[PDB]
């Protein structure tokens, strides 16, 4: 149907993108990563903090276990904190490590993920 229209360059949500890598013995699917990020956010930041930070998984590459997660521009450290507190999901231990942060997806990829074959 007729989806809403973008939004003025002053009301539009301001974002930052986080490039991350999951260190683990077990594999993870795109869906598990989306789920574990929502889960940690809800626990660590709560329903309110989650609505403020607006964690949003852009993409996850199961092969290299790297991905991109978006957050409100001004609360990147809170999302980094929620990700850091993750220790395991679905019986698989893991460590999420943030590789870098950028104002755009294109810049993030170029300096932090090209190395992992993103392009």
């Amino acid at each position: 149907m007729r989806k809403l229209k973008t939004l003025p360059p002053t009301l539009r949500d301001k974002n930052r993108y986080i490039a991350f890598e999951i260190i683990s013995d077990g594999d993870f699917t795109k869906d598990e990563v989306k789920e574990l990020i929502w889960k940690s956010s809800l626990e660590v930041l709560g329903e309110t903090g989650t609505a403020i930070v607006k964690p949003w998984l852009i993409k996850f590459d199961p092969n290299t276990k790297t991905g991109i997660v978006r957050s409100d521009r001004e609360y990147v450290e809170y999302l980094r904190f929620a990700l850091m507190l993750v220790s395991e999901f679905n019986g698989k231990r893991l460590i999420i490590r943030t590789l870098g942060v950028s104002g755009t997806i294109k810049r993030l990829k170029r300096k932090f993920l090209a190395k992992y074959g993103w392009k």
Binding site: R2, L4, L42
Partner: protein, 208 residues
């Protein structure tokens, strides 16, 4: 609680007992009568004499049902509940009194900057309901809060008339004025603006 402070109004109570409770905390209460087929000119007229201030609430109405109501009942307040942008659009164009929580059962605020200005042009108001938040699970509540926060930004910028309400369907859904106000604060409103959403703005809506 009834005179000393600011006159607080509850624009959206949908239950008898809720009303009785709301009447103890709010100076004025508007009871909404839900119609999803036709506007029972009977119950609507009798309900208006049992509560006083009443309004017609159309949920997921057909564009046709809206047109018919905006005419035949130009003396009643008409509220619209839809998660359909097409129905939301039309309702705004037809001059209805308010759109209630368009974000319910959607994945967006149910309102952008163009509809925000269209509302201001047709004098249509935006209602922020507490109820959806009450019964939602964690994931659902986070999404609702995000949508409402955005809705508030659009409304505050384009000066769209707005109001907070419990949209109570049961006694237990009602909340005291000062508490209901925290909902507005949490989604972005300054305390003074939250208070205005349950007093000043309701006035304007009832001004007609």
């Amino acid at each position: 609680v009834g005179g000393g402070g600011v006159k607080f109004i509850e624009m959206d109570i949908r239950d008898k007992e809720a009303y009785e409770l709301a009447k103890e905390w709010f100076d004025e209460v508007v009871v909404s009568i839900k119609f999803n087929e036709e506007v029972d000119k009977e119950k609507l007229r009798e309900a208006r004499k049992e509560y006083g201030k009443v309004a017609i609430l159309l949920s997921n109405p057909k564009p046709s049902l809206v047109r018919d109501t905006v005419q035949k009942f130009k003396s009643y307040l008409i509220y619209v509940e839809s998660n359909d942008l097409r129905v939301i659009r039309y309702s705004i164009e037809k001059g209805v009194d308010a759109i209630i929580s368009p974000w319910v059962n959607r994945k967006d605020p149910g309102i952008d900057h163009v509809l925000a200005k269209l509302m201001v042009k047709k004098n249509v108001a935006l209602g922020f309901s507490l109820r959806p938040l009450l019964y939602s699970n964690p994931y659902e509540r986070a999404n609702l809060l995000r949508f409402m926060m955005k809705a508030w930004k659009l409304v505050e910028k384009y000066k769209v008339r707005r109001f907070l309400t419990s949209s109570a369907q049961e006694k237990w859904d009602v909340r005291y004025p000062r508490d209901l106000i925290s909902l507005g604060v949490v989604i972005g409103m300054e305390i003074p603006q939250a208070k205005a959403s349950i007093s000043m703005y309701p006035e304007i809506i009832l001004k007609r």
